[PDB]
Each structure stands twice: as structure tokens, then as C-alpha cells.
């Protein structure tokens, strides 16, 4: 019944980059293929006088054969016609860390409590996403209040991802 075409997904109306700046703690993640960020994921968003949004991120990533490593990542956001949809160029402060360019959608936020992010890296031929990821962010590292949690669950369902998240632990690894 529900529409899982990426083109149907609502995003944050009149998204305000300035209000979004600051520290966001990842509480949950839906992983893409070949997942990168594992846990202890903390993002820091900024916007400059030109209105350009950028971010940094720390988090544990586990390179294969079980090598752990606290990644330090950088992202810069190119605006689109939709104020809540961006193109995010990202790289690590170390050369060997994953780089690339992903869609970055702010699906919903209230700026001071929760945020829901979404990226479709590759569409299916029917307009659904073949390879997606999504972060749920909290301003408080101890988690969302119940009212925000319930709003987020609804947004998760609207993205057709509600069954596919895992919790992100924070234990001072970094």
C-alpha cells in the first residue's frame, strides 16, 4: 500500500541550516551496503556567512579482519532547489578513509531535540531505493524523549525503513 518511491518522501519544510548547527549524537542507524560508521557516532554541523553548511563526524569504524579505528570525517553540503535536500561531499582527515558524495536529506527535525536524516545512494528501477542509509540524531546523548521518539518512529516508517535500524552505542570509545 504505502509509497516507498524515494520521489514521494517528504522532507523538512523550510529547513533552517543555522538552527541545525551544533552537536548531534547518532542514536540509531540504518546501514547501507558496505557500512562504514559503526558506533560512537557524533556529528558537528556548522554554517558559514555564505550560508554553506558543513559538518564533521567522529565514530568507530571497523576495517575488515576486525581492526577498530576512530574515524574523523569531514563533510560539505551543496544546496539544491529543495532547502532540505543536499549533496554531501565527504572524506576522512586520513587519506585512506572512505571518501565519496552522497545525497543528504533532512527528512525531519525540530532542531533542539531530534533529527532524521536519509540518503539514497542508488535507486531501484521502480523508484524505490536499492541502497540507502539513515541516521536518527539526538541533541542529548542519553536519547530522545518519548514524544520525539514517537515522531521519529513515524518518519522511519514513512521512509520504509522502520524495521531496519540498529541502536548506536556511546561508550567514550573515541
Ligand X SMILES: CCCCCCCCCCCCCCCC(=O)O
| 75 contributes a contact to ligand X by CB under 6 A | yes
Could you tell me the smallest distance in angstroms from the CB atom of residue 104 to Cl ion? 24
Q: Rounded distance, CA 156 to CA 170, Å?
A: 22
Residue 2 or 163: the one with the smaller Cβ distance to Cl ion is 163
Stretch binding ligand X (CB under 6 A), from 36-44, 105-113, 153-161, 163-171: 36-44
Q: Per-residue x/- marks for Cl ion, 130-159, CB under 5 A?
A: --------------------x---------
163 contacts Cl ion (rule: CB under 5 A): yes
Q: Contact at 8 Å (CB) between 58 and 71?
A: yes
CB nearer ligand X, residue 34 or residue 146: 34
Please give the DSSP secondary-structure letter assigned to residue 154.
H
The piece of 30-38, 79-87, 108-116, 153-161 that touches ligand X (CB under 6 A) is 30-38
- Ranges within 42-61 binding ligand X (CB under 6 A): 43, 55, 57
Say which entry of ligand X, Cl ion, none residue 165 contacts (CB below 5 to 8 A, set by partner kind). none
Closest Cα to residue 97, out of 137, 136, 132, 56? 56
Q: Which does 35 bind (CB under 5 to 8 A by kind): ligand X, Cl ion, none?
A: ligand X
**CA–CA distance, 76 with 16 (Å, rounded to integer):** 16
Q: Annotated binding residue at 98? A: yes
Around 82, how many Cα atoms within 13 Å sit in the side-chain half-sphere? 15
Strand stretches in 8-165, DSSP E: 22-30, 39-47, 53-63, 67-79, 85-92, 100-109, 114-123, 129-138
Amino acid at each position: 500500500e504505502r509509497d516507498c518511491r524515494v520521489s514521494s518522501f517528504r522532507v523538512k519544510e523550510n529547513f533552517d541550516k543555522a538552527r541545525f548547527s551544533g552537536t548531534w549524537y547518532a542514536m540509531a542507524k540504518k546501514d547501507p551496503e558496505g557500512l562504514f560508521l559503526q558506533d560512537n557516532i557524533v556529528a558537528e554541523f556548522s554554517v558559514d556567512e555564505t550560508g554553506q553548511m558543513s559538518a564533521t563526524a567522529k565514530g568507530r569504524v571497523r576495517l575488515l579482519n576486525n581492526w577498530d579505528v576512530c574515524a574523523d570525517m569531514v563533510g560539505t553540503f551543496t544546496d539544491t532547489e529543495d532547502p532540505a535536500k543536499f549533496k554531501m561531499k565527504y572524506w576522512g582527515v586520513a587519506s585512506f578513509l572512505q571518501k565519496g558524495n552522497d545525497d543528504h536529506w533532512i527528512v525531519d527535525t525540530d532542531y533542539d531535540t531530534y533529527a532524521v536524516q536519509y540518503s539514497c545512494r542508488l535507486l531501484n528501477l521502480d523508484g524505490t531505493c536499492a541502497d540507502s542509509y539513515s541516521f536518527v540524531f539526538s541533541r542529548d546523548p542519553n536519547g530522545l524523549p518519548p514524544e520525539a521518539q514517537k515522531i521519529v518512529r513515524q518518519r522511519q516508517e514513512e521512509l520504509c525503513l522502520a524495521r531496519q535500524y540498529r541502536l548506536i552505542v556511546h561508550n567514550g570509545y573515541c
